[PDB]
Amino acid sequence: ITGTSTVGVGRGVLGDQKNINTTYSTYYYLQDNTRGDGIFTYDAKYRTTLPGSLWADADNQFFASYDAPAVDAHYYAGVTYDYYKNVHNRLSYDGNNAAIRSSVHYSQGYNNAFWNGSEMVYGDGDGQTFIPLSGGIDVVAHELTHAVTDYTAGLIYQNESGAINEAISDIFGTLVEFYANKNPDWEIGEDVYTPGISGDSLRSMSDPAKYGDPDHYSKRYTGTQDNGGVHINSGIINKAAYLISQGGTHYGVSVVGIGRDKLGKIFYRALTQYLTPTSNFSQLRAAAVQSATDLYGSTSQEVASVKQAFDAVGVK
Numbered sequence: 001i002t003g004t005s006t007v008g009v010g011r012g013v014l015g016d017q018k019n020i021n022t023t024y025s026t027y028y029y030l031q032d033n034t035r036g037d038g039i040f041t042y043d044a045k046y047r048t049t050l051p052g053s054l055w056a057d058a059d060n061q062f063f064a065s066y067d068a069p070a071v072d073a074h075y076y077a078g079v080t081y082d083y084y085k086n087v088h089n090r091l092s093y094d095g096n097n098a099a100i101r102s103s104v105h106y107s108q109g110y111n112n113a114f115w116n117g118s119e120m121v122y123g124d125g126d127g128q129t130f131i132p133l134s135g136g137i138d139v140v141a142h143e144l145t146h147a148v149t150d151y152t153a154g155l156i157y158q159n160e161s162g163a164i165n166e167a168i169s170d171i172f173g174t175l176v177e178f179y180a181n182k183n184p185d186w187e188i189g190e191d192v193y194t195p196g197i198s199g200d201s202l203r204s205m206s207d208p209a210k211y212g213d214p215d216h217y218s219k220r221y222t223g224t225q226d227n228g229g230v231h232i233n234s235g236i237i238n239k240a241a242y243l244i245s246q247g248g249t250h251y252g253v254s255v256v257g258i259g260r261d262k263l264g265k266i267f268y269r270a271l272t273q274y275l276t277p278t279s280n281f282s283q284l285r286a287a288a289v290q291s292a293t294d295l296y297g298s299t300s301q302e303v304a305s306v307k308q309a310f311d312a313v314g315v316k
């Protein structure tokens with residue numbers, strides 16, 4: 001929509017108040033003109049046709065409960081954009097400031113969110129398993145990272161390359177959560193998962209097994225469910241990423257942590273320079289080692305830690 005840039009105010013899924021960038025032209029739209037070619041948030045109106053209608057509001061105030069998921073999808077997409085630009089010098093998911101589009105209120109009681117190849121889509125959850133998915137900053141960043149992966153490595157969504165695709169989104173979803181410093185942790189989806197149960201989450205990067213996911217290559221899922229276990233085997237890579245950053249002793253292998261920032265630098269470089277559509281775990285290890293080498297030299301502690309972490313999870 002062509003109009004005047006302004007700032008509205010609303011309340012997100014968790015009841016928090018935040019300012020959002022909108023555009024005025026008769027109505028106030030969830031169109032952020034301050035980031036690249038824009039961030040656009042749509043109303044899917046409980047249907048499955050996408051993208052739906054660009055979110056229109058009469059007074060630039062978004063405090064209705066129906067508004068909450070829109071406020072968060074719009075706001076968190078902005079934070080994620082800032083992270084990539086500020087931290088990795090990447091302009092939007094395609095690196096050329098492509099417009100970011102998200103649709104909320106997708107279907108009825110839909111317990112998931114996804115990147116459909118063109119935009120992000122968020123369900124409202126059934127109120128038991130999930131509340132509106134856009135309320136979790138790690139969820140939004142995870143989805144947008146799927147876009148980044150699509151335009152870079154292009155990791156195929158099945159088997160090992162798919163598990164890497166998933167891990168990359170969890171890793172960067174987590175790094176964005178720390179970047180926004182929103183009660184950061186190494187868990188995935190804790191803010192929108194099971195409103196009636198405290199302390200749980202969808203996945204854990206620090207301890208994948210906590211939720212039944214493998215934390216070692218010898219325990220990888222070899223079946224066909226979940227596209228060959230893309231959301232299951234990602235636990236092995238998530239654990240490796242956690243070790244590289246924080247350090248620790250896993251299955252008797254000791255890893256000196258090098259911190260979150262370097263973890264982000266190493267994985268972003270691996271993703272954008274070395275990974276290919278069919279890369280497997282072993283190739284990921286090689287890509288990560290090469291990235292750390294480029295960045296810190298072959299005799300660096302950073303290189304040593306990446307090696308130890310992959311050794312720890314049994315990926316040679």
Ligand SMILES: O=C(NCC(=O)N1[C@@H](c2ccccc2)CC[C@H]1C(=O)O)[C@@H](S)Cc1ccccc1
Nearest residue numbers: 111112113114133138139142188189202226231
């Ligand atoms: O992990 C994801 N989605 C969940 C998902 O797609 N799956 C698992 C899941 C767990 C819990 C509830 C729903 C879904 C199971 C296998 C697979 C699936 O449903 O196909 C990613 S792709 C999106 C997401 C991230 C964080 C929080 C919520 C959603």
Ligand SMILES: [Ca+2]
Nearest residue numbers: 057059061062
């Ligand atoms: Ca309003």
Ligand SMILES: [Ca+2]
Nearest residue numbers: 182183184185
């Ligand atoms: Ca958190």
Ligand SMILES: [Ca+2]
Nearest residue numbers: 138187188189
């Ligand atoms: Ca989290």
Ligand SMILES: [Ca+2]
Nearest residue numbers: 193194195197
């Ligand atoms: Ca919960």
Ligand SMILES: [Zn+2]
Nearest residue numbers: 142146166169
């Ligand atoms: Zn995903």
